[PDB]
Scaffold this active site. Structure first.
Site, mmCIF file in Angstrom:
data_model
loop_
_atom_site.group_PDB
_atom_site.id
_atom_site.type_symbol
_atom_site.label_atom_id
_atom_site.label_comp_id
_atom_site.label_asym_id
_atom_site.label_seq_id
_atom_site.Cartn_x
_atom_site.Cartn_y
_atom_site.Cartn_z
ATOM 1 N N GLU A 65 -1.798 7.496 -10.069
ATOM 2 C CA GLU A 65 -1.771 5.963 -10.255
ATOM 3 C C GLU A 65 -3.501 5.515 -9.849
ATOM 4 N N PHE B 80 13.054 5.961 2.742
ATOM 5 C CA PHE B 80 12.308 6.952 1.882
ATOM 6 C C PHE B 80 11.588 6.398 1.149
ATOM 7 N N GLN B 81 10.104 6.822 1.215
ATOM 8 C CA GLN B 81 9.064 6.292 0.339
ATOM 9 C C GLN B 81 8.796 4.474 0.510
ATOM 10 N N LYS C 248 14.076 -2.341 -5.499
ATOM 11 C CA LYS C 248 14.930 -1.682 -6.348
ATOM 12 C C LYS C 248 16.267 -2.441 -6.769
ATOM 13 N N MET D 266 -27.595 9.310 -5.460
ATOM 14 C CA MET D 266 -27.949 8.290 -4.635
ATOM 15 C C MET D 266 -27.942 8.470 -2.934
HETATM 16 C C1 LIG Z 1 12.193 15.015 -2.957
HETATM 17 C C2 LIG Z 1 12.637 14.608 -1.733
HETATM 18 C C3 LIG Z 1 14.023 15.122 -1.346
HETATM 19 C C4 LIG Z 1 14.191 15.091 0.002
HETATM 20 N N1 LIG Z 1 15.515 15.806 0.331
HETATM 21 C C5 LIG Z 1 15.862 16.019 1.664
HETATM 22 C C6 LIG Z 1 17.225 16.576 1.961
HETATM 23 O O1 LIG Z 1 17.978 16.873 1.343
HETATM 24 N N2 LIG Z 1 17.390 16.843 3.374
HETATM 25 C C7 LIG Z 1 16.430 16.657 4.376
HETATM 26 O O2 LIG Z 1 16.644 17.036 5.602
HETATM 27 N N3 LIG Z 1 15.271 15.977 4.229
HETATM 28 C C8 LIG Z 1 14.786 15.737 2.843
HETATM 29 N N4 LIG Z 1 13.592 14.753 2.575
HETATM 30 C C9 LIG Z 1 12.612 14.850 3.644
HETATM 31 C C10 LIG Z 1 12.906 13.436 4.482
HETATM 32 O O3 LIG Z 1 12.721 12.342 3.588
HETATM 33 C C11 LIG Z 1 12.545 13.296 5.827
HETATM 34 O O4 LIG Z 1 11.077 13.322 5.654
HETATM 35 C C12 LIG Z 1 12.937 14.258 6.773
HETATM 36 O O5 LIG Z 1 14.581 14.493 6.378
HETATM 37 C C13 LIG Z 1 12.756 13.937 8.150
HETATM 38 O O6 LIG Z 1 13.009 15.027 8.903
HETATM 39 P P1 LIG Z 1 12.766 14.883 10.573
HETATM 40 O O7 LIG Z 1 13.840 13.798 10.952
HETATM 41 O O8 LIG Z 1 13.279 16.241 10.880
HETATM 42 O O9 LIG Z 1 11.453 14.550 11.022
HETATM 43 P P2 LIG Z 1 10.438 13.389 11.214
HETATM 44 O O10 LIG Z 1 10.781 12.519 10.037
HETATM 45 O O11 LIG Z 1 9.063 13.768 11.465
HETATM 46 O O12 LIG Z 1 10.991 12.553 12.486
HETATM 47 C C14 LIG Z 1 10.996 13.586 13.628
HETATM 48 C C15 LIG Z 1 11.896 12.627 14.677
HETATM 49 O O13 LIG Z 1 11.540 13.251 16.039
HETATM 50 C C16 LIG Z 1 11.010 12.468 16.857
HETATM 51 N N5 LIG Z 1 10.059 13.598 17.528
HETATM 52 C C17 LIG Z 1 8.850 13.764 17.370
HETATM 53 N N6 LIG Z 1 8.285 14.537 18.079
HETATM 54 C C18 LIG Z 1 9.093 14.828 19.184
HETATM 55 C C19 LIG Z 1 9.098 15.461 20.724
HETATM 56 N N7 LIG Z 1 7.910 16.214 20.946
HETATM 57 N N8 LIG Z 1 10.070 15.360 21.297
HETATM 58 C C20 LIG Z 1 11.320 14.733 21.145
HETATM 59 N N9 LIG Z 1 11.479 13.965 19.887
HETATM 60 C C21 LIG Z 1 10.339 14.047 18.987
HETATM 61 C C22 LIG Z 1 10.281 11.468 16.081
HETATM 62 O O14 LIG Z 1 9.508 10.453 16.817
HETATM 63 C C23 LIG Z 1 11.476 11.131 15.267
HETATM 64 O O15 LIG Z 1 12.231 10.433 15.516
HETATM 65 C C24 LIG Z 1 13.260 14.749 1.174
HETATM 66 C C25 LIG Z 1 12.177 14.417 0.826
HETATM 67 C C26 LIG Z 1 11.561 14.458 -0.614
HETATM 68 C C27 LIG Z 1 10.316 14.072 -0.978
HETATM 69 C C1 LIG Z 2 -25.240 2.480 -6.758
HETATM 70 C C2 LIG Z 2 -25.314 0.825 -6.853
HETATM 71 C C3 LIG Z 2 -26.426 0.137 -7.123
HETATM 72 C C4 LIG Z 2 -26.566 -0.969 -7.376
HETATM 73 N N1 LIG Z 2 -27.451 -1.494 -7.646
HETATM 74 C C5 LIG Z 2 -27.784 -2.949 -8.029
HETATM 75 C C6 LIG Z 2 -29.035 -3.420 -8.406
HETATM 76 O O1 LIG Z 2 -29.933 -2.861 -8.181
HETATM 77 N N2 LIG Z 2 -29.086 -4.873 -8.874
HETATM 78 C C7 LIG Z 2 -27.905 -5.646 -9.277
HETATM 79 O O2 LIG Z 2 -28.137 -6.800 -9.396
HETATM 80 N N3 LIG Z 2 -26.820 -5.158 -8.624
HETATM 81 C C8 LIG Z 2 -26.581 -3.846 -8.145
HETATM 82 N N4 LIG Z 2 -25.230 -3.058 -7.730
HETATM 83 C C9 LIG Z 2 -24.083 -3.919 -8.339
HETATM 84 C C10 LIG Z 2 -23.898 -5.113 -7.252
HETATM 85 O O3 LIG Z 2 -23.190 -4.596 -5.773
HETATM 86 C C11 LIG Z 2 -23.120 -6.477 -7.396
HETATM 87 O O4 LIG Z 2 -21.637 -5.931 -7.914
HETATM 88 C C12 LIG Z 2 -23.457 -6.955 -8.631
HETATM 89 O O5 LIG Z 2 -24.952 -7.494 -8.432
HETATM 90 C C13 LIG Z 2 -22.886 -8.385 -8.630
HETATM 91 O O6 LIG Z 2 -22.883 -9.140 -9.764
HETATM 92 P P1 LIG Z 2 -22.429 -10.641 -10.302
HETATM 93 O O7 LIG Z 2 -22.833 -11.534 -8.923
HETATM 94 O O8 LIG Z 2 -23.065 -11.064 -11.341
HETATM 95 O O9 LIG Z 2 -20.965 -10.531 -10.314
HETATM 96 P P2 LIG Z 2 -19.628 -10.690 -9.385
HETATM 97 O O10 LIG Z 2 -20.023 -9.990 -8.221
HETATM 98 O O11 LIG Z 2 -18.583 -10.774 -10.087
HETATM 99 O O12 LIG Z 2 -20.000 -12.200 -8.953
HETATM 100 C C14 LIG Z 2 -19.776 -13.126 -9.869
HETATM 101 C C15 LIG Z 2 -20.271 -14.510 -9.247
HETATM 102 O O13 LIG Z 2 -19.647 -15.335 -10.420
HETATM 103 C C16 LIG Z 2 -18.687 -16.323 -9.950
HETATM 104 N N5 LIG Z 2 -18.071 -16.674 -11.199
HETATM 105 C C17 LIG Z 2 -17.083 -15.793 -11.839
HETATM 106 N N6 LIG Z 2 -16.279 -16.249 -12.932
HETATM 107 C C18 LIG Z 2 -16.868 -17.564 -13.005
HETATM 108 C C19 LIG Z 2 -16.699 -18.625 -14.330
HETATM 109 N N7 LIG Z 2 -15.850 -18.483 -15.300
HETATM 110 N N8 LIG Z 2 -17.521 -20.053 -14.016
HETATM 111 C C20 LIG Z 2 -18.334 -19.965 -12.974
HETATM 112 N N9 LIG Z 2 -18.695 -19.230 -11.793
HETATM 113 C C21 LIG Z 2 -17.914 -17.863 -12.264
HETATM 114 C C22 LIG Z 2 -17.772 -15.672 -9.125
HETATM 115 O O14 LIG Z 2 -16.937 -16.294 -8.198
HETATM 116 C C23 LIG Z 2 -19.025 -15.034 -7.839
HETATM 117 O O15 LIG Z 2 -19.533 -16.048 -7.145
HETATM 118 C C24 LIG Z 2 -25.317 -1.998 -7.422
HETATM 119 C C25 LIG Z 2 -24.071 -1.258 -7.154
HETATM 120 C C26 LIG Z 2 -23.866 0.182 -7.092
HETATM 121 C C27 LIG Z 2 -22.700 0.669 -7.042
HETATM 122 C C1 LIG Z 3 10.296 11.880 -6.262
HETATM 123 C C2 LIG Z 3 9.132 10.914 -6.591
HETATM 124 N N1 LIG Z 3 8.163 10.385 -7.952
HETATM 125 C C3 LIG Z 3 7.970 11.211 -8.899
HETATM 126 C C4 LIG Z 3 7.243 9.365 -7.616
HETATM 127 C C5 LIG Z 3 6.013 9.678 -7.167
HETATM 128 C C6 LIG Z 3 4.506 9.034 -7.684
HETATM 129 N N2 LIG Z 3 3.470 9.094 -7.282
HETATM 130 C C7 LIG Z 3 3.175 9.881 -6.168
HETATM 131 C C8 LIG Z 3 1.654 9.875 -5.835
HETATM 132 N N3 LIG Z 3 4.261 10.312 -5.495
HETATM 133 C C9 LIG Z 3 5.431 10.259 -6.069
HETATM 134 N N4 LIG Z 3 6.179 10.978 -5.136
#
Ligand SMILES: Cc1cc2nc3c(=O)[nH]c(=O)nc-3n(C[C@H](O)[C@H](O)[C@H](O)COP(=O)(O)OP(=O)(O)OC[C@H]3O[C@@H](n4cnc5c(N)ncnc54)[C@H](O)[C@@H]3O)c2cc1C
Ligand SMILES: Cc1cc2nc3c(=O)[nH]c(=O)nc-3n(C[C@H](O)[C@H](O)[C@H](O)COP(=O)(O)OP(=O)(O)OC[C@H]3O[C@@H](n4cnc5c(N)ncnc54)[C@H](O)[C@@H]3O)c2cc1C
Ligand SMILES: CCN(C)Cc1cnc(C)nc1N
Ligand SMILES: COC(=O)c1ccccc1S(=O)(=O)NC(=O)N(C)c1nc(C)nc(OC)n1
Ligand SMILES: COC(=O)c1ccccc1S(=O)(=O)NC(=O)N(C)c1nc(C)nc(OC)n1
Ligand SMILES: Cc1ncc(CNC(C)CS)c(N)n1
Ligand SMILES: CCCOP(=O)(O)OP(=O)(O)O
Ligand SMILES: CCCOP(=O)(O)OP(=O)(O)O
Ligand SMILES: [K+]
Ligand SMILES: [K+]
Ligand SMILES: [Mg+2]
Ligand SMILES: [Mg+2]
EC number: 2.2.1.6
Lengths: 597, 593
Positions: B56, B118-119, B168, B488
């Site tokens: 992403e 979840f997620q 969703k 750099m």
């Molecule tokens: C594609 C996908 C499919 C999934 N399918 C499944 C599935 O089918 N079945 C499944 O089980 N999971 C599944 N999951 C995982 C799921 O989302 C949960 O992450 C997982 O079930 C959480 O398990 P948990 O509750 O044991 O652990 P946690 O989420 O870590 O929760 C632990 C719990 O234990 C408590 N606890 C922590 N430390 C202590 C301690 N020292 N003493 C007492 N309590 C404590 C916490 O505070 C909390 O309430 C899936 C995930 C994905 C990505």
């Molecule tokens: C490794 C590294 C080195 C760098 N070295 C340099 C360097 O030596 N010299 C340098 O210049 N920069 C350098 N930079 C880039 C620097 O950090 C700034 O991103 C850059 O100077 C910003 O330029 P800007 O103000 O023109 O654009 P922006 O930061 O986008 O600012 C634009 C300004 O214009 C205004 N404005 C926007 N649209 C409109 C519109 N339609 N009408 C009226 N006003 C508007 C904004 O709101 C804002 O105040 C470096 C960056 C890195 C990653």
């Molecule tokens: C089961 C989930 N999936 C494919 C969506 C998804 C997209 N991008 C990332 C970083 N993680 C994910 N889990």
């Protein structure tokens, strides 16, 4: 008291000193301008090993993997702006799965904050909702304090991530003032009495149960004795055990009392046991929506038992936020689960046997195995078959095996078909479900456990997200084994598209690169296998290869993960595997997609 | 009043229709669970084209590149949780450089929000600071409205990113009731007074300087009206990094780029100018240098009411934010420059000023250590050569870059003459921007020759998008100036941290084998004698291609203004000094570097 031992040092040097005091031996990060003062201070430092990725997201996921495998917090050190925004996903990921992580982000000088300065971001504001706590150090005097608070909050209660923003002027600044000794150094009798009262009620209720089930999660793994006490309770009271995805490995699946995984894609036997139990003993699990199915249909028998005062739900939870959040529970035992299981043990009446209950459960085990369409002459390799075989091959090496995965079908099959026996051996993203987690988590896990066989069972789409970290593995010296179950699709999504969107696959097929050539370009050995008769040899070669290696297995496509419980279905209203239906669905797919899939 | 053209449609289908209404011809995204209802509605849609990345972050940067080259807002469509958080960097980046972008993120059903579903992620909260505006659609009835507000906001004032969270259950819901048609279809004196005062102040100017930025490029007539004013009143023009391409650098009145790494001549003119005419620039800290030492002559000219600073700013928040100005002309720069043109007397000469300026031009050029027999290829040389080779092609050329030295060298040593041809990350400075930005630009301008001048470390960040280029059919040209380092940063470590290179050297993969694996042509060059041939083969290749050029390491970008230095207190190039530093680095690093 006052401490003068840091007077004269820079913020960066103080940071360096605090790392060894916090017992930190590994740091994952990527340098940048704003964080320079700290990097210069850790230049050649032998206080810890530094792991450099190609992208900050990689550093974050590596840290999580490291934390999951070692039990220690993962430490990330990145720069301001883009460096910080690149770790939001890993933080959001650790937040959902309760992973301890301390994220240090460099920031622009405090005098530039709020001026739309170069590489400035409101990281504290951005990470507010995906960290247990965060802060921007405003002075070098408070640096030690903040670091100490960060590590404590990240590793206590339910573990989680924390962020500490570090202004360049603070880390470059020199400490010219003595600071409180406390800030540099890393149980009510009524409360304990209340917990003990909860434990007694839990014990009484357990001693009453006729069809008990232990619903175990990640919480049991947050204590070294967790698995041991769980097994003891299970043996003592003859209670079947089912774990969540995050609890896999906490219970020996070789044990006859193992019900395997429950949930959306869990074993039907586990789900049936939960739907029929009169008492559900939740241990370190949070009743997430991937586990409960339609909540109004969740655990009907336990609900009935509660209405009749002879059962219901007991919950060992460490965080007040997750108590009675999803379902009403009869007894909540607050605190560390392991610690409370130990205190309750003596109050549990030893049970001779539960013949009816076990008999019923065994009938289900025979009726609902993890069935699937196995290989047939000329067909492609089945993904489930790969997991089964790799599980055996990996187990037979006798080495300590750690498994990481990406997100999707391969993840579920790894969960279902692998034989889990050891704690801290399954590292996977469940709450947020971040694709791309597999590779970096494995790299981090390998750093944590240099002697372990670390396997990343990945999906092709997931792997693409972070494949650039392959060179990082080489540079880090981590002999990770990357397994790509390539179905040339985003399996979990096509599955939902197949079931709920009449086979209309919208943008769920990405063009993959040549994984084997990619691996070689990245510096590791690459292997491919597409023929059934070559799988065994390849898995063997894969596992026994000395350095990092990637193995791609071309697997069949559009193969659904079953059983499955979704929508308004109850855990006992699952879709089961049926070879006839799969064949019909395949025909229907070829027509609807115009022969494209 | 009421509209029913959408009644009976799902939120997803309405989304498909709205893209058409907003005249969207391209959508960058990645599917996911929560956003499924929308992906089903746009399945095989004829309303627009879809570009699918491997990550992403790629989608976000691809949309930024697209926006930069087309002038249209970049549309992103991702899922909830990780899909949404993975787009945070692109939004923060688009927010910093003012790029029009509408990010649509799928969200878990409203009945699941707040349950740690979840997620699920508090996307609205996370993106508050990096979006001009965001919202969560609570019902399908308001979907058309929110979409219209999003595009309007993203494209008005200072263009920027906006986010629309789509539950969703909302996108899956079917519109039952009719909705307001108005929600389905896409002081003046004070300004005029400033326009007049500005005109007069430009007349009393003896040493005027036009300080132009990206703002001038936010209007089709910007560059043209800038040239007009420059010729009319004979005023030298200097542009920021984001301003490059809005003024022809072949024009004698061109001062080139100013700032931290800008042309010395440009910085001196600014420090000695009695009147600075800021047009679409925000006086960021990479341009002004030590703010206290900024524009001394303009400050004195302001104290004597005979000059100072005139600022054409569209955003009130950016007026008098950095330095106090004498005159402020709010609104679109191009528009106000057109209403002020007539009130300007055609200055036919400025000998004294131009004389001094040309004096600096001759003593302070972009000098650097050029190649010698047996030495490695110099990066600056590659930029100059490619600039010429690309021009000779005769076709439209768009350039994108990563972040770092290569980025600065690309800015200095390239001859900019066309608007919207330089797409680089300046505000946030996001490494890995090069490739995805190029792909986005190539989609916007299919006929253009799009070149990504990247650094090895920057490239590694998002190199997975190479396969996306192939799947998208974008014949981008990827150039990698490989010095096997974080240029750099090592430069700063060399200058301010006694050559202590702390983790600034990453292990690179084989770029050529990588390119081939990803499905494109790979070319490498190490010898000076082969550079020209390779560059030609590089640009004349049909499909996407990657060319790695091994360049000299530890080469500092000059001139340079850092710390508490004023734009006139820059560090200039010196061949002997470089040899001394090279010897010092070797001694200090034990021969390693
Ligand atoms: C594609 C996908 C499919 C999934 N399918 C499944 C599935 O089918 N079945 C499944 O089980 N999971 C599944 N999951 C995982 C799921 O989302 C949960 O992450 C997982 O079930 C959480 O398990 P948990 O509750 O044991 O652990 P946690 O989420 O870590 O929760 C632990 C719990 O234990 C408590 N606890 C922590 N430390 C202590 C301690 N020292 N003493 C007492 N309590 C404590 C916490 O505070 C909390 O309430 C899936 C995930 C994905 C990505
Ligand atoms: C490794 C590294 C080195 C760098 N070295 C340099 C360097 O030596 N010299 C340098 O210049 N920069 C350098 N930079 C880039 C620097 O950090 C700034 O991103 C850059 O100077 C910003 O330029 P800007 O103000 O023109 O654009 P922006 O930061 O986008 O600012 C634009 C300004 O214009 C205004 N404005 C926007 N649209 C409109 C519109 N339609 N009408 C009226 N006003 C508007 C904004 O709101 C804002 O105040 C470096 C960056 C890195 C990653
Ligand atoms: C089961 C989930 N999936 C494919 C969506 C998804 C997209 N991008 C990332 C970083 N993680 C994910 N889990
Ligand atoms: C992120 O940069 C900052 O933290 C910073 C931000 C705003 C003003 C002044 C500074 S600074 O003067 O104190 N430092 C600085 O500019 N640094 C540290 C920096 N580092 C590198 C590697 N490249 C560049 O600029 C092109 N600046
Ligand atoms: C992202 O998930 C959600 O949006 C969702 C979140 C919490 C509860 C219920 C749902 S849902 O039932 O309405 N949808 C769902 O679970 N979806 C859409 C989904 N999509 C894919 C591709 N995989 C999985 O689960 C493994 N779920
Ligand atoms: C995405 C990202 N990560 C880290 C940096 C760190 N900084 C520089 C400018 C050097 S490597 C950056 N600019 N962009
Ligand atoms: C759910 C994510 C998509 O794709 P991936 O290739 O990673 O996995 P699978 O195709 O195994 O579901
Ligand atoms: C800003 C530094 C990072 O590295 P990159 O390799 O992208 O390039 P340069 O070495 O040109 O600075
Ligand atoms: K199993
Ligand atoms: K130039
Ligand atoms: Mg797949
Ligand atoms: Mg480099």
């Amino acid at each position: 008291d006052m401490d003068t031992s840091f007077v004269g040092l820079t913020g960066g040097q103080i940071f360096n000193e605090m790392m060894s005091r916090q017992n930190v031996d590994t740091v994952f990060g990527y340098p940048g301008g704003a964080i320079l003062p700290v990097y210069d201070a850790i230049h050649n430092s032998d206080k810890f090993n530094f792991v450099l990725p190609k992208h900050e997201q990689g550093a974050g996921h590596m840290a999580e993997g490291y934390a999951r495998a070692s039990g220690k917090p993962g430490v990330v050190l990145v720069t301001s702006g883009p460096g910080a925004t690149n770790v939001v996903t890993p933080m959001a990921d650790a937040f959902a799965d309760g992973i301890p992580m301390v994220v240090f982000t460099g920031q622009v000088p405090t005098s530039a904050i709020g001026t739309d300065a170069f590489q400035e971001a409101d990281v504290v504001g951005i990470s507010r909702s995906c960290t247990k706590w965060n802060v921007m150090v405003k002075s070098v005097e408070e640096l030690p304090l903040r670091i100490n608070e960060a590590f404590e909050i990240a590793t206590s209660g339910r573990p989680g991530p924390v962020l500490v923003d570090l202004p360049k002027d603070v880390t470059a600044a020199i400490l010219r003032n003595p600071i409180p000794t406390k800030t540099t150094l890393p149980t009510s009798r009524a409360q304990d009495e209340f917990v003990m009262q909860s434990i007694n009620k839990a014990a009484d209720l357990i001693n009453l149960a006729k069809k008990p089930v232990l619903y175990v999660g990640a919480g049991i793994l947050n204590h070294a004795d967790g698995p041991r006490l769980l097994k003891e309770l299970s043996d003592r009271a003859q209670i079947p055990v089912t774990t969540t995805l995050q609890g896999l490995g906490s219970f020996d699946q070789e044990d006859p009392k193992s019900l395997d995984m429950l949930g959306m894609h869990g074993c039907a036997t586990a789900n049936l046991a939960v739907q029929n139990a009169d008492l559900i003993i939740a241990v370190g699990a949070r009743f997430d929506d991937r586990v409960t199915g339609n909540i109004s249909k969740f655990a009907p028998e336990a609900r009935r038992a509660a209405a009749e005062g002879r059962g219901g739900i007991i919950h060992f939870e460490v965080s007040p936020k997750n108590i009675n959040k999803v379902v009403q529970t009869q007894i909540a035992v607050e605190g560390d689960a392991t610690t409370n299981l130990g205190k309750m043990m003596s109050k549990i009446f030893p049970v001779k046997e539960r013949s009816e209950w076990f008999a019923q459960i065994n009938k289900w085990k025979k009726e609902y195995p993890y069935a699937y369409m196995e290989e047939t002459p000329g067909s492609k390799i089945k993904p489930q078959t790969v997991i089964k075989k790799l599980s055996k091959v990996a187990n037979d090496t006798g080495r300590h095996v750690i498994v990481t995965t990406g997100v999707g079908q391969h993840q579920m099959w790894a969960a279902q078909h692998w034989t889990w026996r050891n704690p801290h051996t399954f590292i996977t993203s469940g709450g947020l479900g971040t694709m791309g987690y597999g590779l970096p988590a494995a790299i981090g896990a390998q750093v944590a456990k240099p002697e372990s066989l670390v396997i990343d069972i990945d999906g092709d789409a997931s792997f693409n997200m972070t494949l650039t970290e392959l060179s990082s593995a080489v540079q880090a010296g981590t002999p990770v084994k990357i397994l790509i179950l390539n179905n040339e699709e985003q399996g979990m999504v096509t599955q939902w598209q197949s079931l709920f969107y009449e086979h209309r696959y919208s943008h769920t097929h990405q063009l993959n690169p040549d994984f084997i050539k990619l691996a070689e370009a990245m510096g590791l050995k690459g292997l491919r296998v597409k023929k059934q008769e070559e799988l065994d040899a390849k898995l063997k070669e894969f596992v026994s290869t000395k350095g990092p290696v990637l193995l791609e297995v071309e697997v069949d496509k559009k193969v659904p993960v079953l059983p499955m419980v979704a929508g308004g279905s109850g855990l006992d209203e699952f879709i089961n595997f049926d070879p006839e239906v799969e064949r019909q669905q395949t025909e229907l797919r070829h027509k609807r997609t115009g022969g494209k899939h």
